[PDB]
C-alpha cells in the first residue's frame, strides 16, 4: 500500500480530510500500517516550522480518533506524552491536541495512569482555558468527556475515586477566561452534572457555582437547571435565590422563580418544610411587589403548599393557619381581595382536599 506513504507525506500539503480518507483506505488495506504512519508522523511534527508540525498533528489526532481498534493503555499514555509536550511548547498546535483529548476521553481506552496523568498535568503545563478562543473552547469539551467517560457515576468511582475532589478544582482552574456563550453553557452543564451525578461533592461544594456566577450575566437556562440539579445546591440555592427575590430586573426575578420552582420540586419536603415561613414571607413581599413574575410566584406558592401537603400534613396545616391568620380580614372585608383570593386559588388548585380547605375557609367570609 503506497497509499500509506503518499498520505503520510501529503498531509503536509494541507490536504486536510482528503489525505485522511487515504490514510483510512491504507489502514483498511494493510491493517497494520496505522501504527507505522503514526510513528512516522511522531517525528514528522517534530520540525519547528508551523505548517509541518500543525498539519502532522491534526492528521495524527484525526487518525487516532479513527483508530480505536488496537490501542493499548500504556501505549495510550505514551500517545498523550507528545500531546503534553506540544501543549508545553506552543499554541496554535495545542488546539489539535484539544480535539485529540476530547476524542480520547470518551473511549474506554483510558488507563489509571492516564486518568491520573490527565488530572495532574493537563492543568500543570497546559493550564486549560486560559488563552485563545478555541484553546479555551475545547478544554471544557475534554473535561466534559473525561467526566462522562467513567468518572460520572454510571459505574460509581470504584477505580476513579481519586479524581473526585481534585476534579472540582481542576474544573475551577479552567474558569474566568471563557466569554463565548458556548463555553458558558458548557460550564453550566458541567456544574449541573458534577454536583448531581457525582458523590462526595458536599465536602467541596459551593465553589462550583463560582464559575457559573462569574459567567452569569438570554441562553442562561443551563445555569438555572444547574442550581436546581441536586439538593446539594439546596444550601447554595436559597443562598442566592432569596436575594433574587430582592432583585430589581424582572427577567432575573422570573428566571429565579423558575429555579425555585425546580428547587421546591426536587429538594424533597424537609427543606421546604424548613423554609416555608420565610419563603411565604418573601413571596408575599413579591406579591405586593408584582411570563411575568406574578404567575411564577403563584406557582411557587402552589408547589410549596403542595410539597408541605404531600410531605407532612402538619406543615401544610401550619402554613394554612398562618396564611389564614394573616389574610382573613382581607378575605372577609373588601380590601386586598385580588392578591389573597388568587393566593388561595392557586393553593386550592393543588388537590381536592386543599380546595375544600380553601372553600370552607374563604366562602363563609364573603
Amino acid at each position: 500500500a503506497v497509499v500509506t506513504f503518499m498520505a503520510n507525506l501529503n498531509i503536509d500539503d494541507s490536504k486536510a480530510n482528503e489525505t485522511a480518507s487515504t490514510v483510512t483506505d491504507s489502514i483498511v488495506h494493510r491493517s497494520i500500517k496505522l501504527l507505522e504512519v503514526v510513528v512516522a508522523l511522531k517525528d514528522y511534527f517534530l520540525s519547528e516550522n508551523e505548517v509541518e508540525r500543525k498539519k502532522a498533528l491534526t492528521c495524527l489526532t484525526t487518525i487516532l480518533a479513527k483508530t480505536p481498534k488496537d490501542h493499548l493503555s500504556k501505549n495510550e499514555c505514551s500517545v498523550i506524552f507528545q500531546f503534553y509536550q506540544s501543549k508545553l511548547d506552543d499554541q496554535a498546535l495545542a488546539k489539535e491536541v484539544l480535539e485529540g483529548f476530547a476524542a480520547l476521553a470518551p473511549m474506554k481506552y483510558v488507563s489509571i495512569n492516564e486518568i491520573a496523568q490527565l488530572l495532574r498535568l493537563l492543568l500543570d503545563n497546559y493550564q486549560q482555558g486560559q488563552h485563545l478562543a478555541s484553546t479555551r473552547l475545547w478544554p471544557f469539551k475534554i473535561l466534559r468527556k473525561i467526566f462522562d467517560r467513567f468518572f460520572v457515576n454510571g459505574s460509581s468511582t470504584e477505580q476513579v475515586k481519586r479524581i473526585n475532589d481534585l476534579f472540582i478544582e481542576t474544573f475551577l482552574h479552567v474558569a474566568n477566561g471563557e466569554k463565548d456563550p458556548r463555553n458558558l453553557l458548557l460550564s453550566f452543564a458541567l456544574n449541573k452534572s458534577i454536583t448531581s451525578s457525582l458523590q462526595n461533592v458536599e465536602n467541596f461544594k459551593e465553589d462550583l457555582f463560582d464559575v457559573l456566577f462569574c459567567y452569569f450575566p438570554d441562553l442562561k437556562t443551563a445555569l438555572r437547571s444547574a442550581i436546581t440539579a441536586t439538593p446539594l445546591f439546596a444550601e447554595d440555592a436559597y443562598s442566592n435565590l432569596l436575594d433574587k427575590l430582592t432583585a430589581s430586573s424582572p427577567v432575573v426575578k422570573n428566571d429565579t422563580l423558575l429555579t425555585l420552582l425546580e428547587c421546591v420540586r426536587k429538594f424533597g419536603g424537609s427543606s421546604i418544610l424548613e423554609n416555608w415561613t420565610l419563603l411565604w414571607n418573601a413571596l408575599k413581599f413579591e406579591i405586593m411587589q408584582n411570563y411575568t413574575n406574578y404567575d411564577a410566584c403563584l406557582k411557587i406558592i402552589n408547589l410549596m403548599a403542595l410539597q408541605l401537603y404531600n410531605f407532612d400534613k402538619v406543615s401544610f396545616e401550619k402554613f394554612f393557619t398562618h396564611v389564614l391568620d394573616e389574610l382573613k380580614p382581607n378575605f372577609k372585608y373588601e380590601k386586598d381581595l385580588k392578591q389573597t383570593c388568587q393566593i388561595l386559588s392557586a393553593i386550592g388548585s393543588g388537590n381536592v382536599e386543599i380546595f375544600n380547605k380553601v372553600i370552607s375557609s374563604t366562602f363563609p367570609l364573603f
Binding site: 444550601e235 432569596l242 430582592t246 423554609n275 415561613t277
Partner: protein, 616 residues
C-alpha cells in the same frame, strides 16, 4: 566602578550597577532553590564580582548611619545580586545577612530598617538555612532571661524586648524551617520566662506570636504541612502542658489561655486524619472519660481549649463520647454556675456549640430540651445549642426560634431572653467551612438570613401589639441584637416593617445596636425615600441626641450620627433639609472638639457640608 564612600559617586555607582545586574540576569538567568550555588559558565562580571561585593559592603556597612538612600540602594543591590543563580557563595549571603541584621538593629531609620527587612525576607525565601542560622538564631539570642530588659545590640544602641518578637513576626511567614524552629524556640522562651522569670506581657506576646506564625502557615497549608504541623505540635504541646502546670501567664491570664486554645486549634487543624482519631481518642479520654482534668465534673478554664480542640479534631472519625460530654457540660453549667468563672463558662458554652454543630446530631439536642424551668442556665443551654441548630438550618431551630419569640413576651424572663437573643446570630471563628478543613461541622451560611426571616416579622408584629416599658423594650432589643449581626443590605424585604423599630433602636446604651441601626437607616434611606421623607421630622432630633455627648454616645457613635446626618440630608430633598440646618450646626460643638480628632475632623466636615447645603 571605583571604590567611593561619597554620597554622589557611590549612589551613581550603585544605580549603574542596578542596570548591570539586570543585563547579567537577562543574559544568564536567576536563582532557583536548586541553583543556589550553580554559576554560569563565563562572564566579565565574575572578574568584577569582588569589586562589586566590596563596594556594596562598604556602601551598606562601614558607612555613616545618616545614609538613607545609600543604604537602601545598598541592600537593594545586595538582594538583586543574590537573585542570581549561584553566583554568590553561601559565605557572601551570610555576610549580607549579618550586615542586614546589624544595620537593622543598630539604626531605627525606617528606611534602612524596612529595606533590611525586605532584603532579609528575600534571603529567607531564597535561602532557608542561611537566614535561619545567621539572623534568626542571633535575634532569638539577643532576648534575655528576664522580661523588660534593654536588648543591648552593642555598646550603645539597644532595641526593645518586643523588637525581637516584631522581627520574628516580619519574616518566617512562608519559610518552613524558619517558622517551625521559631515556633519551637518561642515556646521554649515562653516556658522559660514563665518558670525562671515572672512575666505576663512577654508570655502573652510570645503566645500571640506563636498564634500568628501558625495562622500565617495555615493560610498557605504548605509552610507547615500536615506532617510538619503534626511534628511541630508534638514539639510544642508537651511544652504547653508543662507551662500549664506552672502558674505562668497562660494560666494566670485567661487571655493567654485563649491564645493557647487558638494555637491548639490551628495545629490540630493541620493534622492528618489517620492521626486525628487516636489524638481525638486521647482527648476523648483525657477530657471526658478519664484523666486528672475532668470537664464533666469540675469547671476549669483549660476546658475552653478543649472546645478549640474538638472543632479542630476530626468529625468523621470515631468519637463515641459526644452526647455524654454534652450532657455532662450541661449538668456542670446547671450546677456549678455560681462557681464557674467567666472563662470556664464561656469555654463550656463553646464546647456545647462545638458538639451541637459537629459531633452530636440534632436528636441529642432535641432530647435535651426542657422549657419547664425558666432559669438563666436553661436558657443559655437551649440558646447555645439551637444556635448550632440554626447553623445547621433545620425546622427545630427555626421553630424553637418562634418558641423563643413567644417566651420573649414574658416580663422578667422575656427581657433576659431578649438581651441574650444575640447569641443565635454571631460569627464563630472556629466552626465554619474554613479553607482546608472540610469535616469542620454541618456548616450552613444561610443561618443568619434565615434566622432574621424567622424572627423579625413576629417580633415586629408583637411590638406593634405591645404597650409597656418591659415587653416593647424586649422586642426592640431582640430585633436589634438579631439585625446587628445579619448584614443590613442582605435583609431588604424586612426593612419596611423594620423602620418603626429601626427608629426605636436609636436610643439605648449599647453602641453595638447603635452602629447597627445607624447602618440600617443608611441602607434604608439609600433604598427607601418615602419612609425617610415622612419620618425626617422625627429622625432628625433623634440623630441630634445621638450626636450629643453622652454616657452612651461614644466618639464613634457620634461619628456615625454625623454620617447618618449627612446621608439623610443627601437623600431628603432640600425642602426639609433647609429646615434642619441650624440645629445640626449648633448641637455639634462637643463633637468637633472631643477627645478623638477623626471625630473632630468629620464633625467639622459635617458642619461645613450642612452649612453649604443650607446656604444654597
Amino acid at each position: 566602578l571605583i571604590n567611593t564612600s561619597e554620597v554622589a559617586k557611590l549612589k551613581l555607582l550603585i544605580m549603574n550597577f542596578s542596570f548591570f545586574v539586570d543585563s547579567y540576569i537577562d543574559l544568564f538567568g536567576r536563582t532557583s532553590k536548586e541553583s543556589l550555588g550553580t554559576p554560569v559558565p563565563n562572564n566579565k562580571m565574575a572578574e568584577y564580582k569582588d569589586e562589586i561585593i566590596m563596594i556594596l559592603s562598604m556602601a551598606l556597612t562601614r558607612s555613616s548611619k545618616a545614609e538613607v538612600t545609600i543604604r537602601t540602594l545598598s541592600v537593594i543591590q545586595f538582594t538583586k545580586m543574590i537573585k542570581m543563580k549561584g553566583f554568590l557563595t553561601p559565605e557572601e549571603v551570610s555576610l549580607i545577612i549579618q550586615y542586614f541584621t546589624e544595620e537593622i538593629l543598630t539604626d531605627n531609620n525606617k528606611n534602612i530598617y524596612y529595606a533590611c527587612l525586605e532584603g532579609l525576607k528575600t534571603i529567607s525565601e531564597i535561602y532557608e538555612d542561611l537566614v535561619f542560622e545567621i539572623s534568626l538564631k542571633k535575634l532569638l539570642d539577643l532576648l534575655p532571661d528576664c522580661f523588660e530588659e534593654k536588648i543591648r545590640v552593642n555598646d550603645e544602641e539597644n532595641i526593645h524586648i518586643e523588637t525581637i518578637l516584631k522581627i520574628i513576626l516580619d519574616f518566617t511567614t512562608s519559610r518552613h524551617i524558619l517558622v517551625k524552629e521559631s515556633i519551637t524556640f518561642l515556646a521554649t522562651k515562653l516556658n522559660r520566662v514563665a518558670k525562671i522569670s515572672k512575666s505576663r506581657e512577654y508570655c502573652f506576646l510570645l503566645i500571640s506570636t506563636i498564634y500568628s506564625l501558625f495562622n500565617n502557615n495555615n493560610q498557605n497549608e504548605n509552610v507547615l504541612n500536615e506532617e510538619d504541623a503534626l511534628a511541630l505540635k508534638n514539639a510544642i504541646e508537651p511544652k504547653l502542658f508543662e507551662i500549664i502546670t506552672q502558674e505562668s501567664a497562660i494560666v494566670s491570664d485567661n487571655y493567654n489561655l485563649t491564645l493557647l486554645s487558638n494555637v491548639l486549634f490551628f495545629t490540630n487543624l493541620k493534622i492528618p486524619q489517620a492521626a486525628h482519631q487516636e489524638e481525638l481518642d486521647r482527648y476523648n479520654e483525657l477530657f471526658i472519660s478519664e484523666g486528672k482534668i475532668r470537664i464533666l465534673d469540675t469547671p476549669n478554664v483549660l476546658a475552653i481549649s478543649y472546645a478549640k480542640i474538638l472543632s479542630a479534631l476530626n468529625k468523621n472519625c470515631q468519637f463515641p463520647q459526644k452526647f455524654t460530654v454534652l450532657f455532662g457540660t450541661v449538668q456542670l453549667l446547671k450546677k456549678h454556675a455560681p462557681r464557674m468563672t467567666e472563662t470556664e463558662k464561656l469555654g463550656y458554652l463553646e464546647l456545647l456549640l462545638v458538639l451541637s454543630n459537629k459531633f452530636v446530631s440534632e436528636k441529642d439536642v432535641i432530647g435535651l430540651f426542657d422549657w419547664k424551668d425558666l432559669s438563666v442556665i436553661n436558657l443559655e443551654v437551649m440558646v447555645w445549642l439551637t444556635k448550632g441548630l440554626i447553623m445547621q438550618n433545620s425546622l427545630e431551630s427555626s421553630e424553637i426560634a418562634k418558641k423563643f419569640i413567644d417566651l420573649l413576651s414574658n416580663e422578667e424572663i422575656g427581657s433576659l431572653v431578649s438581651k441574650l437573643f444575640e447569641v443565635f446570630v454571631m460569627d464563630i471563628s472556629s466552626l465554619k467551612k474554613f479553607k482546608g478543613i472540610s469535616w469542620n461541622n454541618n456548616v450552613k451560611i444561610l443561618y443568619k438570613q434565615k434566622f432574621f426571616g424567622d424572627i423579625f416579622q413576629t417580633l415586629v408584629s408583637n411590638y406593634k401589639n405591645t404597650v409597656d416599658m418591659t415587653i416593647k423594650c424586649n422586642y426592640l432589643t431582640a430585633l436589634s441584637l438579631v439585625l446587628k449581626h445579619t448584614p443590613s443590605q442582605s435583609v431588604g424585604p424586612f426593612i419596611n416593617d423594620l423602620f418603626p423599630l429601626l427608629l426605636q433602636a436609636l436610643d439605648m446604651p449599647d453602641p453595638e445596636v447603635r452602629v447597627s441601626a445607624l447602618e440600617t437607616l443608611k441602607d434604608t434611606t439609600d433604598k427607601h425615600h418615602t419612609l425617610i421623607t415622612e419620618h425626617v421630622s422625627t429622625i432628625v432630633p433623634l440623630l441630634l441626641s445621638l450626636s450629643l455627648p453622652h454616657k452612651y454616645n461614644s466618639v464613634s457613635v457620634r461619628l456615625i450620627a454625623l454620617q447618618l446626618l449627612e446621608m439623610i440630608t443627601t437623600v431628603v430633598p432640600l425642602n426639609y433639609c433647609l429646615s434642619y440646618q441650624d440645629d445640626v450646626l449648633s448641637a455639634l460643638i462637643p463633637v468637633l472638639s472631643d477627645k478623638k480628632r477623626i471625630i473632630r475632623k468629620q464633625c467639622v466636615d459635617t458642619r461645613q457640608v450642612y452649612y453649604e447645603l443650607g446656604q444654597i
